[PDB]
């Protein structure tokens, strides 16, 4: 029988914000959001933090400070706001989902001081637990006096009633639970970690467990990067405590016009120059690969892989790949790891790893019992971490059979559906893959077919867009030049590189170029058709034959080379160069 006047005041002003504040048009937007919220499977009401700050800056600041304290009142005010407005079902739970908070903290910044107060954060999911109903308002009854101890809220643990509702009786130990009357809500535990950008080099990220409820339960998935609004809270555990961030709302982690406007004038001028820059193709490869001699076709193909073609979803709902898959087979040494390392070093979203990696994830999503809870959890592997990114996998020859089939499923589908021990889930992974392998017996037998040269299954061969063969040539000139490049790098400790375009400028151009979706000119369409006629007419003998899969790579490559110049339509120049790369990539059996 005690009322928090701050909470009463916050509830009233928040209810006033619901029922008076309005859009630029002058209509109560939140009435419309509530109007849409009346549907089934709709209980979380979105709210803009900046809007209620404008309505009452004190209300927003007080809510920010005492978010956990005031949040039940917000739901109650939402219930009053929504119940009378329409024929909402009399009692279904309702929640308030916040957003528009500028105070985005790193995981390093979380402290006991930040308990209860609202905050926004961003990180990468690691493992996702199954959904589980959790009691919120426990309904109990002492066995002796049989008075219903109603609505004992449990602080995230089996908190029985302290004492009987009957003052006369003090059984204190035999409160039986009412299953139906106790209020429940579904919670899902998820692990997140610091994103690589915020993460200092060589520093272990601050792993964090979070709780997901209402529409947030399935909002994010395993291995994805997302931004979360909510607050940190202690949780007692076996006076011990541990921290968990309850996120009311979950959002993903971050158009050409918006980028170009947001892009500064100097960045715009440079990118504008870069788009105008002819021969950016070779110039970018040289800048991207300073400590490399020769093998520029590999540098060419990787750059196209960095850009990638436009994905397409058919009217039947069938997704068509936008990115691509490229593999390298090379003799011992020969810079394949160096190629992958440079790609990983330059590119965010580019993750390095090895096929020898003995992790239980196996580079991909995995279902594993919790080390403590013993429940199975969908733990994301590095491939899922590279969603909409790149994976620089090493030892691709030396993969495992389990990873091999799962990877084959992934590249075939662009997604992985994982099911075991009753638990089931699916995850999107549109990730360019850079396979690094060595020939069987170490050295590449050009006289033998590629199937003989590598252990990879034919489906792996089919689903890879390109294959580059590196061989230790006895030609001293290349050997001398490589030594010259290496020794100059070592002697000229820095400054040996020749970056005609800075890596940030390179990355900025790729980002802006990625905003474009080049289309196929009917000229280019017949040109592409004409190219495949030559390839079909060529008919290898090639180490591998020529199916429609080759054409699919060709069009995706042409889209990437259309993306190279940021042109909204494809031209024959892109097609012929794409044909040049792939046709040169076809290594004939040298027997």
């Amino acid at each position: 029988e005690v009322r928090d006047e701050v909470a009463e005041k916050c509830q009233k002003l928040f209810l006033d914000f619901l029922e008076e504040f309005q859009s630029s048009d002058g209509e109560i937007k939140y009435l419309q959001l509530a109007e849409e919220l009346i549907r089934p499977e709709r209980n979380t009401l979105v709210v803009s933090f900046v809007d209620l700050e404008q309505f009452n800056q004190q209300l927003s600041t007080t809510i920010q400070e005492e978010f956990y304290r005031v949040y039940p009142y917000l739901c109650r005010a939402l219930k009053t706001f929504v119940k009378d407005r329409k024929e909402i079902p009399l009692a279904k739970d309702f929640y308030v989902a916040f957003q528009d908070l500028p105070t985005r903290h790193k995981i390093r910044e979380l402290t006991s001081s930040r308990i209860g107060l609202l905050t926004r954060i961003s990180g990468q999911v690691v493992r996702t637990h199954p959904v589980h109903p959790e009691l919120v308002s426990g309904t109990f009854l002492c066995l002796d006096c049989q008075t219903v101890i109603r609505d004992v809220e449990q602080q995230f643990k089996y908190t029985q009633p302290n004492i009987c509702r009957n003052p006369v009786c003090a059984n204190r130990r035999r409160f039986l639970l009412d299953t139906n009357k106790s209020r429940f809500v579904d919670f899902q535990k998820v692990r997140i970690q610091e994103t690589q950008a915020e993460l200092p080099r060589g520093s272990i990220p601050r792993s964090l467990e979070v709780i997901l409820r209402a529409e947030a339960v399935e909002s994010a998935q395993a291995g994805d990067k997302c931004d979360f609004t909510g607050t940190l809270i202690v949780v007692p555990d076996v006076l011990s405590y541990r921290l968990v961030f309850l996120a009311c709302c979950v959002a993903p982690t971050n158009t050409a016009e918006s980028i170009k406007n947001q892009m500064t004038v100097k960045e715009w001028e440079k990118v504008f120059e870069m788009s105008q820059d002819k021969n950016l193709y070779h110039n970018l490869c040289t800048s991207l690969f300073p400590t490399i001699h020769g093998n520029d076709e590999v540098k060419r193909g990787v750059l196209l892989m960095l850009f990638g073609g436009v994905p397409k979803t058919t009217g039947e709902g069938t997704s068509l790949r936008g990115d691509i898959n490229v593999c390298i087979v090379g003799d011992p040494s020969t810079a394949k790891s160096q190629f992958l390392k440079h790609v990983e070093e330059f590119s965010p979203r580019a993750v390095y790893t090895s096929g020898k990696a003995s992790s239980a994830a196996g580079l991909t999503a995995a279902v594993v019992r919790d080390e403590e809870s013993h429940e199975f959890v969908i733990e994301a592997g590095a491939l899922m971490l590279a969603d909409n990114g790149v994976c620089c996998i090493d030892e691709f020859d030396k993969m495992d059979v389990r990873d091999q089939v799962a990877i084959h499923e992934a590249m075939e589908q662009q997604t992985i559906s994982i099911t075991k021990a009753g638990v089931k889930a699916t995850l999107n992974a549109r990730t360019s893959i850079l396979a690094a392998a060595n020939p069987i017996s170490g050295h590449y037998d050009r006289s033998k077919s590629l199937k003989q040269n590598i252990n990879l299954s034919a489906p792996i061969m089919s689903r890879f867009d390109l294959f580059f063969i590196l061989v230790d040539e006895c030609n001293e000139v290349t050997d001398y030049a490589i030594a010259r490049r290496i020794v100059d790098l070592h002697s000229r400790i820095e400054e040996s590189i020749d970056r005609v375009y800075s890596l940030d400028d390179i990355r900025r151009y790729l980002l802006f170029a990625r905003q474009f979706k080049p289309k196929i000119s009917k000229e280019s369409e017949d040109f592409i058709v004409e190219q495949y006629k030559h390839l079909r007419q060529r008919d290898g003998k090639s180490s591998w034959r020529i199916t429609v899969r080759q054409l699919e790579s060709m069009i995706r490559l042409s889209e990437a080379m259309a993306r190279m110049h940021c042109c909204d339509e494809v031209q024959p120049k892109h097609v012929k160069e794409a044909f040049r790369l792939l046709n040169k990539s076809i290594i004939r059996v040298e027997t």
Partner: protein
């Protein structure tokens, strides 16, 4: 009578409870139907032919004649169901010296995606496809242990170092409960073709008892009515899993009708 403040609270009142029980007891003989056959009396004889202790009741008959009882039935699933079970047992013992009642012909059929917390702890009907089954498990029992030398009770321990003081004594059972004293668990998913595009098919678990022991086979399509309600599960404190206490199960012949 009716029109209380909450249906669950109103049926909990003894006055309306026995009123409804007598009214249903009246309904257990007066419902001769348009055929005029004393339909309940037929089923009592049929059940007592083999002592099947499981009656099939149409929600239409309750809604048409009693109306108020049927309307409170989804709002008061357990209470009215036991009112039906106790009433039927009295008629069986009177005519043929426990009897269970199964409600059928529920007007609204739902999908696994469709059901939500709004329907929690309520009887509802749906059609799905059985994905797997198990045996008729013996019993689920929850045990709570009064601490040895402290005023504490350890939490439920499902069966089929006190956190306050860390007393190493064996502890004494403060309270114990048994639920599902003989029970088979199955799983049912959304039927093929009813999938919501690329979404994985939903899945739910149905717990069946002697009312519906082994009423199906895995991989079959069935129309099931049961209490979508929360309950414990076999696993600090044991987790609360939402299940469907199967009240009435109906098959889908040929899988396409």
């Amino acid at each position: 009578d009716l029109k209380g403040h909450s249906v669950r609270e109103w049926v909990s009142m003894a006055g309306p409870r026995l009123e409804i029980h007598h009214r249903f007891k009246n309904f257990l003989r007066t419902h001769v139907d348009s055929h005029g056959h004393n339909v309940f009396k037929e089923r009592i004889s049929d059940m007592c032919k083999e002592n099947r202790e499981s009656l099939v009741v149409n929600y239409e008959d309750l809604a048409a004649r009693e109306h108020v009882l049927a309307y409170f039935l989804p709002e008061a699933p357990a209470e009215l169901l036991q009112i039906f079970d106790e009433a039927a047992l009295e008629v069986v013992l009177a005519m043929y010296p426990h009897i269970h009642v199964r409600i059928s012909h529920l007007p609204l059929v739902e999908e696994l995606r469709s059901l939500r917390q709004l329907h929690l702890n309520q009887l509802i009907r749906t059609s799905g496809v059985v994905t797997s089954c198990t045996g008729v498990l013996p019993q689920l029992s929850m045990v709570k242990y009064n601490c040895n030398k402290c005023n504490f009770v350890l939490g439920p321990f499902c069966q089929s170092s006190c956190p306050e003081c860390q007393s190493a004594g064996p502890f004494e059972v403060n309270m114990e409960e048994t639920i599902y004293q003989n029970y088979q668990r199955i799983r049912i998913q959304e039927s093929p073709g009813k999938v919501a595009a690329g979404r994985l098919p939903r899945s739910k678990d149905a717990i069946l008892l002697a009312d519906l022991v082994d009423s199906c086979k895995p991989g079959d399509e069935i129309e099931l009515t049961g209490i979508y309600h929360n309950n414990y599960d076999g696993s600090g404190f044991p987790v609360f899993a939402t299940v469907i206490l199967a009240n009435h199960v109906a098959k889908k012949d040929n899988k396409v009708a």
